[PDB]
Amino acid sequence: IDFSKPFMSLGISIMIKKPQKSKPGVFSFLDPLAYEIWMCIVFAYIGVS
């Protein structure tokens, strides 16, 4: 058959799952340390006092 001129140029692309904006949590300033450290600091604080 004899095609006509392309009316839509395309190709092979890459599709991935759209990511999320990862809205920071309210209490995210605690993230640098683990929950165990934060809990142990309170225990250490009480003990020292």
Ligand X SMILES: CCCCCCCCCCCCCCCC(=O)O
Candidate ranges 5-13, 14-22, 23-31, 37-45; the one touching a second copy (CB under 8 A): 5-13
Q: What is the DSSP letter of 26?
A: T
Name the minimum Å distance from CB 34 to a second copy. Answer: 12
DSSP 23: P
Contacts of 30 by beta carbon, 8 Å cutoff, 6+ apart: 38
Structure tokens at 41: 């600091």
Residues near ligand X (CB under 6 A): 30, 35, 38-39, 41-42, 45
Residues near a second copy (CB under 8 A): 3, 5-6, 9
